[PDB]
Design a binder for this molecule. Structure first.
Ligand SMILES: *[C@@H]1O[C@H](CO)[C@@H](O[C@@H]2O[C@H](CO)[C@@H](O[C@@H]3O[C@H](CO)[C@@H](O)[C@H](O[C@H]4O[C@H](CO)[C@@H](O)[C@H](O)[C@@H]4O)[C@@H]3O)[C@H](O)[C@H]2NC(C)=O)[C@H](O)[C@H]1NC(C)=O
Ligand SMILES: *[C@@H]1O[C@H](CO)[C@@H](O[C@@H]2O[C@H](CO)[C@@H](O[C@H]3O[C@H](CO[C@H]4O[C@H](CO)[C@@H](O)[C@H](O)[C@@H]4O)[C@@H](O)[C@H](O)[C@@H]3O)[C@H](O)[C@H]2NC(C)=O)[C@H](O)[C@H]1NC(C)=O
Ligand SMILES: *[C@@H]1O[C@H](CO)[C@@H](O[C@@H]2O[C@H](CO)[C@@H](O[C@@H]3O[C@H](CO)[C@@H](O)[C@H](O)[C@@H]3O)[C@H](O)[C@H]2NC(C)=O)[C@H](O)[C@H]1NC(C)=O
Ligand SMILES: *[C@@H]1O[C@H](CO)[C@@H](O[C@@H]2O[C@H](CO)[C@@H](O[C@@H]3O[C@H](CO)[C@@H](O)[C@H](O)[C@@H]3O)[C@H](O)[C@H]2NC(C)=O)[C@H](O)[C@H]1NC(C)=O
Ligand SMILES: *[C@@H]1O[C@H](CO)[C@@H](O[C@@H]2O[C@H](CO)[C@@H](O[C@@H]3O[C@H](CO)[C@@H](O)[C@H](O)[C@@H]3O)[C@H](O)[C@H]2NC(C)=O)[C@H](O)[C@H]1NC(C)=O
Ligand SMILES: *[C@@H]1O[C@H](CO)[C@@H](O[C@@H]2O[C@H](CO)[C@@H](O[C@@H]3O[C@H](CO)[C@@H](O)[C@H](O)[C@@H]3O)[C@H](O)[C@H]2NC(C)=O)[C@H](O)[C@H]1NC(C)=O
Ligand SMILES: *[C@@H]1O[C@H](CO)[C@@H](O[C@@H]2O[C@H](CO)[C@@H](O[C@@H]3O[C@H](CO)[C@@H](O)[C@H](O)[C@@H]3O)[C@H](O)[C@H]2NC(C)=O)[C@H](O)[C@H]1NC(C)=O
Ligand SMILES: *[C@@H]1O[C@H](CO)[C@@H](O[C@@H]2O[C@H](CO)[C@@H](O[C@@H]3O[C@H](CO)[C@@H](O)[C@H](O)[C@@H]3O)[C@H](O)[C@H]2NC(C)=O)[C@H](O)[C@H]1NC(C)=O
Ligand SMILES: *[C@@H]1O[C@H](CO)[C@@H](O[C@@H]2O[C@H](CO)[C@@H](O[C@@H]3O[C@H](CO)[C@@H](O)[C@H](O)[C@@H]3O)[C@H](O)[C@H]2NC(C)=O)[C@H](O)[C@H]1NC(C)=O
Ligand SMILES: *[C@@H]1O[C@H](CO)[C@@H](O[C@@H]2O[C@H](CO)[C@@H](O)[C@H](O)[C@H]2NC(C)=O)[C@H](O)[C@H]1NC(C)=O
Ligand SMILES: *[C@@H]1O[C@H](CO)[C@@H](O[C@@H]2O[C@H](CO)[C@@H](O)[C@H](O)[C@H]2NC(C)=O)[C@H](O)[C@H]1NC(C)=O
Ligand SMILES: *[C@@H]1O[C@H](CO)[C@@H](O[C@@H]2O[C@H](CO)[C@@H](O)[C@H](O)[C@H]2NC(C)=O)[C@H](O)[C@H]1NC(C)=O
Ligand SMILES: *[C@@H]1O[C@H](CO)[C@@H](O[C@@H]2O[C@H](CO)[C@@H](O)[C@H](O)[C@H]2NC(C)=O)[C@H](O)[C@H]1NC(C)=O
Ligand SMILES: *[C@@H]1O[C@H](CO[C@@H]2O[C@@H](C)[C@@H](O)[C@@H](O)[C@@H]2O)[C@@H](O)[C@H](O)[C@H]1NC(C)=O
Ligand SMILES: *[C@@H]1O[C@H](CO)[C@@H](O)[C@H](O)[C@H]1NC(C)=O
Ligand SMILES: *[C@@H]1O[C@H](CO)[C@@H](O)[C@H](O)[C@H]1NC(C)=O
Ligand SMILES: *[C@@H]1O[C@H](CO)[C@@H](O)[C@H](O)[C@H]1NC(C)=O
Ligand SMILES: *[C@@H]1O[C@H](CO)[C@@H](O)[C@H](O)[C@H]1NC(C)=O
Ligand SMILES: *[C@@H]1O[C@H](CO)[C@@H](O)[C@H](O)[C@H]1NC(C)=O
Ligand SMILES: *[C@@H]1O[C@H](CO)[C@@H](O)[C@H](O)[C@H]1NC(C)=O
Ligand SMILES: *[C@@H]1O[C@H](CO)[C@@H](O)[C@H](O)[C@H]1NC(C)=O
Ligand SMILES: *[C@@H]1O[C@H](CO)[C@@H](O)[C@H](O)[C@H]1NC(C)=O
Lengths: 243, 425, 432, 196
């Protein structure tokens, strides 16, 4: 289905500090008030497809009990070319950059009747060739997990934010900027990506576009509001007047 | 040689830094520049190997001093200054090309190599290093393992690698399968032989590219970091962010990922010390115009100086006025050499904010003239004898004649543009 | 629409004469000056860079010219304020007892209680005006900061707001205690009611009208002043002119500062970065590109400032003329000192400007009368000395033109000239 | 310093011309500031770069000078319009505008020609020796209120007169100096006194 991303997918474009100032930036942002594809898993048939990845992606989900495990980024996902395994399973967040013979159904085998443990490991066969490895982030995790991934100039920037929510069938109403998390300097090109799950699914997928935003910085840091300078004539006027 | 009475704006003044400060990350591991430049075998031109190097202390001095490099050209930087610069990361791209084609590797160049297999950006910032490797690469029997791309559908974007082996068609006719009419393989070997003269021998080429001011510094030169001091005019240098100002501990709520800070004018007004993760405020040392108050070369060589917009505590070759003994602080600035008084007269020399300067005795006694500073008086107080049923009527009159001067015109000047610019040429 | 359609009931023997009046007080705002701004051209172009300054020396005396222009602008701002406000040689003070015939100037006279001896309306105006970045004003330390720290400095005005308020208070006291005499010589005391009678004579209304409607006129003046106070307290668009001047200056300064981030074709917009990366010879090209761009920006800013200063000087000259001709006297020029027949004006100091409270006489209630140019009595034509002949339908009277006060036509209200067979429209009537 | 107003204009024009002339000595980045020296040392292809640098600099100087001159000419035109208005309204007539033709009550003005300007000698009337009198708005005579036809009622302490406002010459309050309007019950401050 589709849902409306009111003012979601806003992140700190740069690493500088700004307070009590309105800053205009151009970058890959999620346009205000746009469909973000919403995915569900039915019990049978299982819905978890391979999604495109062009000029970044916006990811959101109402993760509960940490069902969402991680994501795969690549172009073929067949061990012919490089791939990514940003995932945290039970140890710290392990990132692998190698060639993997991904299975037809890559997921953590969990039997739902207490047997909520991974049994069938069909994620991949072997790393085979492999270029670079990164294992770090020994941190765990009605709450919304917003993520922004963008692959630019050989850097895989990732932004994240945590916030409790109360809505069920739609994105929350409000504003919350996404802080940078990591800056993997890989140096590849990505066309397709896919999430991971353990045996339901509820996560939204957006797409960043090159747009100019007028970001408002508050008395004491942080982005409190933003204006999409191409959403409508009123937003264009606001961007021109810097107010 | 004679200056009329008034107040005149002269050379500004500024607080010079007491010393210089550099704060670099205390990374220890040396950069694998030798390993990069030592590589057993260099990749082909079309498959130029790119090595990412970072998180190390780069010492470009030894590379520059080494005489084994025939060509050493830097474009966005200078080799001598490379030792004092901090980069986010550095790329080392190595390959072997024709000797005469080395000049083709400069940014914004044209030629087969630059247009097909290795293109550099027009705004390339880095250093290109090349040297003959005939004896080590070329074989007596003819080393042909080096391949280059000769044909491409279109010019490749800078820093693009093309490893395709599909055959090329040079005409309108289709080229199906692996061969066809006028179908040519895009990869052609190199005829490197020891007998070949200069310009044809293999040349080991390594390209060092690095970008600046887009992320925290990870590669830094071999500069010894010094101690840190604050509340003084100092030439700071954080991760190569050279500048001058007064450092001060700040209460800014920098987020963990935030390194620099910018004001509304978009200039560095806060930095994070690379060694210790603390937020320091950045403030340029005090400055302001200097205005001299004089009663005229006519009347006295005594003068008073005004450091407008500057606190008297803070205070030009001449410094005999720093001693003071009559330093006065005004909303306009610090006034030195003028005796403040508590009277009030008509404004003689305007200083600002209702303060004026004048030359008169006022003791410092009698007949001893000096420059005084006072709050100008608007006039003599008057209380009209207003009442109901009371009127004042003049019993006389005076015929007053006053003069009023009004400019009407100015001299006509005809400036010939061509004669003025290009006189008789 | 351009306004309501109106068709004057014009006839060749019909006149409309007001039977009442309203005392109208209207406010007029005029910019008088703008913030002084001195810019160190060398610092703005080549902040703390000896090599850049040496390169700039090759351009001659552009920096000196720009500094001279800005200094002239600042001195001219001081001159504008002086010319507008320092129109009184003596600081007149109002008497402690405010026996002004029922007129109440409490809201425009100084308030001793406040630390600044400003009137209620002056305080209202000063609160209404907001600046932008900083006007270092109430600054007890260095100037604003960002703009202050790039070779741009703001010089304080020569006359403080307290001094401007003192000048305004002196002008107001002189007016309300001595009419227009203090503007021509020594202030000559006169009761305010008699002064207003003189003003009524000036607008062509007999003084008996004021002496008989004094209470009503005082009430109307007080109500108008109260309405002005309420309007200033409520609305915020009244001071649009001063706000626009301030906003224009702030926007120009912001543009000048922001231009320092432009590369102008150089590798970087940071002089320190250019100098810390390139060797002297190749760095000169980038430094020259930056110098050219920043010099062009400064020249554009200075030209804009010169034009704006000329406009502000024209406005300040107009304000000084208005002060002299409306506050120091009664003006016969139509619509100069407000709408209606001008009576008196009161000055109020405002940030970088002046506010005039023009007191005008407005006819209120107009009637229908038949009128004739002359009266035929005994074969002679009688014309009104001062006024006009009117008829209520049966009887003929002679009245002043601006107020219906019918009177018997006698030989004292009229004068004779010629006979009955020349004037067109002459009417038969007895002259007593 | 009497003619400082004209001297400032002369000085400003002279200084602007001096700056424009001095600007011809600037290199503007060229090897030399002398066109002949540049042309006599480098052949056309190289000489053109220096020539163009000088051209840019000198054109910028000329543009700055001309813009400053245009602004100054606008100011001088405003002053000249003011001078023409003053001639018309003070020399050719008598002005009732306050402080326009000098300080005081304007009587007449005489023009005098000065270099690049005009000088107006404003003759004004200034009251000199004021004296304090008691005054009333009207006079009660016979149940009627009498107002001055033109002047003001004044008292020297015992007697009441009527005088012109701007000069003291007391006169007996008669039916010719005053006019009647209404009765005594409305005017605030009315005083008994016989009207001859
Ligand atoms: C950016 O800057 C300011 C200051 O850095 C900051 O505002 C501060 O927020 C804290 C919140 O804890 C305030 O601390 C309060 O202090 C008062 C008086 O001492 C206490 O009574 C408060 O305790 C009560 O309220 C709390 C909720 O705030 C309750 O949790 C608690 O149980 C008590 O009931 C509290 O400790 C602090 O005073 C302000 N400081 C200022 C200058 O306002 C703010 O977070 C940031 N501003 C933004 C985002 O706009
Ligand atoms: C236009 O103006 C005329 C003013 O002269 C009007 O004529 C006047 O109208 C009034 C009102 O009717 C009238 O007043 C009184 O008249 C009667 C007797 O008059 C005595 O008292 C008056 C006092 O003013 C005095 O002048 C007379 O000589 C006489 O002693 C009273 O009985 C009656 O109640 C009324 O109060 C005037 O007499 C009258 N004056 C003259 C000269 O006619 C006229 O009406 C008006 N026309 C229109 C269409 O409005
Ligand atoms: C009204 O004002 C005028 C002057 O403004 C007064 O008239 C006379 O003016 C002349 C010149 O200023 C003065 O002449 C005097 O002459 C006497 C006699 O020799 C001499 O003793 C004085 O020293 C002075 O030179 C003087 O101001 C005045 N004349 C006199 C006799 O006082 C006039 O007095 C004023 N009062 C009026 C007209 O009521
Ligand atoms: C000329 O115009 C003025 C007003 O501009 C007239 O005065 C006004 O007259 C009316 C009726 O006499 C007054 O209304 C009254 O108000 C009181 C409250 O104070 C109320 O209790 C009464 O029931 C009545 O409504 C009005 O207040 C008064 N305004 C002022 C400022 O005095 C005047 O009557 C007019 N003159 C002529 C000859 O028409
Ligand atoms: C001249 O105008 C001012 C402003 O209208 C007059 O002062 C004001 O007088 C009124 C009535 O006294 C005040 O309203 C109310 O006063 C009573 C006093 O017990 C109380 O209900 C409230 O305090 C309320 O304010 C008004 O506040 C007051 N305003 C000021 C600034 O004083 C003044 O009386 C007039 N001057 C003369 C001589 O009449
Ligand atoms: C020029 O500099 C002096 C000194 O800074 C200013 O006088 C005032 O001096 C005190 C101490 O030197 C400064 O801080 C003080 O802190 C104590 C608490 O420890 C506090 O009680 C004092 O009231 C004061 O704030 C103070 O910053 C400083 N005031 C200013 C405006 O700088 C002097 O006022 C300065 N004058 C100008 C025109 O800047
Ligand atoms: C009163 O103004 C009227 C106009 O409305 C004038 O009307 C008539 O003017 C003539 C001249 O008096 C008179 O009528 C004609 O004149 C002779 C005498 O000159 C008269 O006797 C004849 O009957 C002839 O028609 C007539 O008296 C007069 N109408 C009146 C008085 O009602 C007149 O000029 C003015 N009244 C005069 C002149 O007495
Ligand atoms: C206010 O002005 C009036 C009018 O001048 C003064 O009353 C007048 O005083 C003079 C005194 O010189 C009287 O004239 C002369 O009086 C003497 C003394 O009897 C006499 O011998 C002369 O022949 C001549 O008449 C004048 O008659 C008198 N006028 C009136 C209407 O009483 C009054 O003194 C002045 N008051 C003050 C305080 O100045
Ligand atoms: C201007 O002239 C009038 C006419 O005299 C003066 O008004 C009158 O003054 C007398 C005395 O104050 C009043 O007499 C009083 O009569 C009442 C009874 O109505 C009685 O109780 C008192 O004891 C006293 O005798 C008189 O009524 C009054 N009005 C008239 C028509 O005579 C007026 O005072 C004079 N103006 C000045 C400032 O004196
Ligand atoms: C190749 O390897 C050596 C060692 O890693 C680099 O440095 C040489 O080390 C040997 C033994 O210490 C010395 O005899 C040489 O004089 C060194 N050569 C130079 C240029 O320093 C050497 O730099 C490497 N050659 C490259 C990277 O091109
Ligand atoms: C004034 O009296 C009458 C009243 O009817 C006039 O006709 C009116 O004149 C005035 C115009 O100022 C207003 O009362 C109305 O606007 C007119 N009637 C209209 C427009 O329909 C008349 O002109 C004048 N003199 C008289 C009647 O004697
Ligand atoms: C105003 O106009 C009217 C007519 O429009 C004039 O009164 C007329 O005058 C003529 C000539 O005396 C008579 O024939 C008419 O009988 C009059 N009434 C009409 C034509 O309606 C009147 O004289 C004019 N008054 C003025 C000052 O021009
Ligand atoms: C003019 O000023 C005098 C004195 O200040 C006023 O005299 C007062 O008059 C009223 C009655 O009208 C009395 O209640 C007061 O006692 C008087 N005061 C004094 C000191 O005598 C007078 O009211 C004012 N107004 C006029 C028209 O004269
Ligand atoms: C002028 O008025 C004088 C007194 O009026 C005033 O009295 C005190 C309250 C002060 O304000 C003082 O300055 C005023 O003059 C009287 O002497 C006299 O009536 C008048 N004097 C003259 C020469 O006319
Ligand atoms: C989501 O897509 C639909 C079109 O199917 C349309 O409503 C719009 O493009 C998006 N919805 C909203 C509320 O913006
Ligand atoms: C991008 O990925 C696709 C498929 O993996 C590949 O064909 C293409 O060569 C890649 N582009 C670059 C510049 O490597
Ligand atoms: C999670 O993955 C990491 C890396 O492969 C591994 O060390 C760890 O044992 C795994 N944990 C579980 C429960 O499989
Ligand atoms: C993330 O890694 C940490 C390692 O301590 C682990 O505790 C946690 O369970 C992991 N969280 C997820 C969602 O995998
Ligand atoms: C990656 O694959 C190619 C092809 O075999 C090979 O040359 C290269 O060594 C491989 N890298 C690793 C770590 O095996
Ligand atoms: C570098 O030494 C400094 C103090 O001299 C210290 O702050 C810093 O933590 C050191 N680097 C480390 C521990 O990695
Ligand atoms: C200044 O010049 C004038 C006269 O030429 C005169 O005031 C004085 O002699 C000089 N010296 C002063 C004012 O001290
Ligand atoms: C002026 O008065 C002040 C405060 O009373 C005093 O400090 C000062 O000594 C006096 N004189 C001068 C020249 O400041």
């Amino acid at each position: 289905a589709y849902t409306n991303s009111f003012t979601r997918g806003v992140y700190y474009p740069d690493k500088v500090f700004r307070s009590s100032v309105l800053h205009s930036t151009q970058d890959l942002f999620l346009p205000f008030f746009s469909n973000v594809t919403w995915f569900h898993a039915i019990h049978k048939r299982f819905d978890n497809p391979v999604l495109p990845f062009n000029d970044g992606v916006y990811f959101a989900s109402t993760e509960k009990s940490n069902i969402i495990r991680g994501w795969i980024f690549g172009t073929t996902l067949d061990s012919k070319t490089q791939s990514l395994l940003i995932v945290n399973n039970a140890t710290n967040v392990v990132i692998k950059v190698c060639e993997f013979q991904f299975c037809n159904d890559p997921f953590l085998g969990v039997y739902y009747h207490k047997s909520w443990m991974e049994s069938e490991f069909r994620v991949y066969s072997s790393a085979n060739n492999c270029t670079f490895e990164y294992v770090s982030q020994p941190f765990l995790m009605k709450n919304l997990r917003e993520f922004v991934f963008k692959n630019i100039d050989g850097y895989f920037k990732i932004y994240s934010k945590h916030t409790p929510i109360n809505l069920v069938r739609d994105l929350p109403q409000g504003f919350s900027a996404l802080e940078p998390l990591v800056d993997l300097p890989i140096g590849i090109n990505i066309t397709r990506f896919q999430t991971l799950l353990a045996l339901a699914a509820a996560y939204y997928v957006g797409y960043l576009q090159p747009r100019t935003f007028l970001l408002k910085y508050n008395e004491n840091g942080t982005i409190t509001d933003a204006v999409d300078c191409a959403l409508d004539p009123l937003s264009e006027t606001k961007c021109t007047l810097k107010s | 040689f004679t200056v009329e009475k008034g107040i005149y704006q002269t050379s500004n003044f500024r607080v010079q830094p007491t010393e210089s400060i550099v704060r670099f990350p205390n990374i220890t591991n040396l950069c694998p520049f030798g390993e990069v430049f030592n590589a057993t075998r260099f990749a082909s031109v079309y498959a130029w190997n790119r090595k990412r190097i970072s998180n190390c202390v780069a010492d470009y001095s030894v590379l520059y001093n080494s005489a084994s490099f025939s060509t050493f050209k830097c474009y966005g930087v200078s080799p001598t200054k490379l030792n004092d610069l901090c980069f986010t990361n550095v790329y080392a791209d190595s390959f072997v090309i024709r000797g005469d084609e080395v000049r083709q590797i400069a940014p914004g160049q044209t030629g087969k190599i630059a247009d097909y297999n290795y293109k550099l950006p027009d705004d390339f910032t880095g250093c290109v290093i090349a040297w003959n490797s005939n004896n080590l690469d070329s074989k007596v029997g003819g080393n042909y393992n080096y391949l280059y791309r000769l044909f491409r559908k279109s010019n490749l974007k800078p820093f693009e690698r093309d490893i395709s082996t599909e055959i090329y068609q040079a005409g309108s006719t289709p080229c199906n399968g692996v061969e066809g009419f006028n179908c040519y393989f895009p990869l052609q070997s190199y005829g490197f032989q020891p007998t070949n003269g200069v310009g044809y021998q293999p040349y080991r080429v390594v390209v060092l590219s690095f970008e600046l001011l887009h992320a925290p510094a990870t590669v830094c030169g071999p500069k010894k970091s010094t101690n840190l001091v604050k509340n003084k005019c100092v030439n700071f240098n954080f991760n190569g962010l050279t500048g001058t100002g007064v450092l001060t501990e700040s209460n800014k709520k920098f987020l963990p990922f935030q390194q620099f800070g910018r004001d509304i004018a978009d200039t560095t007004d806060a930095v994070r010390d690379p060694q210790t993760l603390e937020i320091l405020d950045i403030t340029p040392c005090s400055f302001g115009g200097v205005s001299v108050i004089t009663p005229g070369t006519n009347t006295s060589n005594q003068v008073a100086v005004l450091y407008q917009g500057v606190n008297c505590t803070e205070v030009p070759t001449w410094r005999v006025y720093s001693t003071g003994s009559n330093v006065f602080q005004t909303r306009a600035g610090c006034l030195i050499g003028a005796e403040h008084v508590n009277n009030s007269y008509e404004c003689d020399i305007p200083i600002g904010a209702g303060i004026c300067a004048s030359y008169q005795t006022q003791t410092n006694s009698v007949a001893s003239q000096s420059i005084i500073a006072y709050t100008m008086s608007l006039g003599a107080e008057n209380s009209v004898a207003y009442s109901n049923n009371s009127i004042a009527i003049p019993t006389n009159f005076t015929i007053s004649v006053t003069t009023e001067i009004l400019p009407v015109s100015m001299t006509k000047t005809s400036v010939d543009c061509t004669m003025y610019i290009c006189g008789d040429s | 629409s351009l306004g309501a359609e109106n068709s004057v009931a014009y006839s060749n023997n019909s006149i409309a004469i007001p039977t009442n009046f309203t005392i109208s007080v209207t406010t007029e705002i005029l910019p008088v000056s703008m913030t002084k701004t001195s810019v160190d051209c060398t610092m703005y172009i080549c902040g703390d860079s000896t090599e850049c300054s040496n390169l700039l020396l090759q351009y001659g005396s552009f920096c000196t010219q720009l500094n001279r222009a800005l200094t002239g602008i600042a001195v001219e701002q001081d001159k504008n304020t002086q010319e507008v406000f320092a129109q009184v040689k003596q600081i007149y003070k109002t008497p402690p007892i405010k026996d002004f015939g029922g007129f109440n100037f409490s809201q425009i006279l100084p308030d001793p209680s406040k630390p600044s001896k400003r009137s209620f309306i002056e305080d209202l105006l000063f609160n209404k005006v907001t600046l932008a970045d900083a006007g270092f004003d109430i600054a007890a330390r260095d100037l604003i900061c960002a703009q202050k720290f790039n070779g741009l400095t703001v010089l304080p005005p020569l006359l403080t707001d307290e001094m401007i308020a003192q000048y305004t208070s002196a002008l107001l006291a002189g007016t309300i205690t001595s009419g227009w005499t203090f503007g021509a010589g020594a202030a000559l005391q006169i009761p305010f009611a008699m002064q207003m009678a003189y003003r009524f004579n000036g607008i062509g209304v007999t003084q008996n009208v004021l002496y008989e409607n004094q209470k009503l006129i005082a009430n109307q003046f007080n109500s108008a002043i109260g309405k002005i106070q309420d309007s200033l307290s409520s609305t915020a668009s009244a001071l649009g002119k001063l706000q626009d001047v301030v906003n224009q200056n702030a926007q120009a300064l912001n543009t000048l500062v922001k231009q320092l981030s432009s590369n102008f074709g150089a590798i970087s917009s940071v002089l320190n970065d250019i100098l810390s990366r390139l060797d002297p010879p190749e760095a000169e090209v980038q430094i020259d590109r930056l110098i050219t761009g920043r010099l062009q920006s400064l020249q554009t800013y200075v030209t804009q400032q010169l034009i704006r200063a000329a406009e502000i000087r024209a406005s300040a000259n107009l304000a000084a003329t208005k002060m002299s001709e409306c506050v120091l006297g009664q003006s016969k020029r139509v619509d100069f000192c407000g709408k209606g027949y001008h009576l008196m004006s009161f000055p109020q100091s405002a940030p970088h400007g002046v506010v005039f409270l023009h007191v005008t006489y407005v006819p209120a209630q107009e009637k229908n009368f038949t009128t004739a140019p002359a009266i035929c009595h005994d074969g002679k034509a009688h014309f009104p000395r001062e006024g006009v002949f009117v008829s209520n339908g049966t009887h003929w009277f002679v009245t002043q033109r601006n107020f219906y006060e019918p009177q018997i036509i006698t030989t004292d209200n009229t004068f004779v000239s010629g006979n009955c067979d020349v004037v067109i429209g002459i009417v038969n009537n007895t002259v007593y």
